[PDB]
Every structure is written in C-alpha cells, then in structure tokens.
C-alpha cells in the first residue's frame, strides 16, 4: 500500500513532534515523492522540504540537510527558517 | 520433508525480494514454527516476525500485521522499522 502526500505529511509531522527523525525523514520523503509525481494536494513542497531538511540534519547528514535547504530556498527565496538553517548548517560544517 | 529456520528464512527472503508475499508468509511462518520448537539456529525471531508482519500486511490482513508487529516489539522494544510499522498500521486502520 502507499500514502498520499497529505497522509504521509500527517505521519511525518507526528513523528517530528515525538521526536522521531528517522520516521520524519521516511514519511516526508514519501510526501515529496508524491508531490513530484504530480499528486494534486493541499500540502506544499517547501513545507515538506522544511521538515525533511531538519529530520536529516538531526541524524547527522549535514550535506543532505544543506542541499535540501538550498532546494527549499530555490522554491522560496524568502523563507525565514530556511535562511537561518542555511547559515546554521554552513557554520557546523565549517568547524 | 521440512525446512530448518535457516533454509525457510532463506526461501522466504528470496520470495520477499520477488515480491511474492504469499510465499514470504508461508516460508517465514515455517521459520517461526522451527524456532518456537527450540531449533538451534543463527536466525532469530524478531527478523522473521519483521518479514512476516510485512508479508501479511501486503496481502491485506492488517489485524495480523499489527499483532505480529506488537509481538516483535515485545521481543525488541527499540526496533526501528517495527516502531514505524506500528504507527503505519494503526494509521491505516482509521480509515
């Protein structure tokens, strides 16, 4: 079976709150996949990129977190949290 | 004739990749049956329950997959994929 972007986003958001980053990434990736396939949906791609970049960083993959952050800002240059995450990730990696 | 846990697990694994979920289930059930009889084996019960819960879910029997998943986590509370499967199965049955 498979989840819509909406249901996988719901699942990933719960995982996020609790604070299960592996499952936040697994479920947010499913949302992303559904959206890129052209699923009609209320959920938006920057929102999933928001949770996904964070879930990935928490598991130690800064390279991916930064790439997803840059993908996010490509779609939304003015995103507040992602602009800060850009600076924040780059700071960690520079160490 | 009959298979050891090891040989039936092997068979059930090929079937899983193949993706014959009926025969995954058949063969993992046999592996489980051998272990529960006290067969000395490299194969362990959480890994068969892992494939078996998944197999049964694919064939549409969610109540059984939930029960196998709970049985799994009773043996291995911290098991990552079974934790997510618990969330996943409960979510499907809502719904």
Curated annotation (Swiss-Prot), chains A, B:
Subcellular location(s) per record: Endoplasmic reticulum lumen
UniProt name for this protein: Prolyl 4-hydroxylase subunit alpha-1
Role summary: Catalyzes the post-translational formation of 4-hydroxyproline in -Xaa-Pro-Gly- sequences in collagens and other proteins.
Assembly behavior: Heterotetramer of two alpha-1 chains and two beta chains (P4HB)(the beta chain is the multi-functional PDI), where P4HB plays the role of a structural subunit; this tetramer catalyzes the formation of 4-hydroxyproline in collagen.
Family designation: Belongs to the P4HA family.
TPR repeat positions: 46-79
Tissues expressed in: Expressed in the heart, liver, skeletal muscle, kidney, placenta, lung and pancreas.
């Amino acid at each position: 079976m498979f989840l819509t972007a909406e249901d996988s986003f719901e699942l990933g958001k719960v995982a996020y709150t609790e604070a299960d980053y592996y499952h936040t990434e697994l479920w947010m990736e499913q949302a992303l996949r559904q959206l890129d396939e052209g699923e009609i949906s209320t959920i938006d791609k920057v929102s999933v990129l928001d949770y996904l970049s964070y879930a990935v960083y928490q598991q130690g993959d800064l390279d991916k977190a930064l790439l997803l952050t840059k993908k996010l800002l490509e779609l939304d240059p003015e995103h507040q949290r992602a602009n800060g995450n850009l600076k924040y990730f780059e700071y960690i990696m520079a160490k």
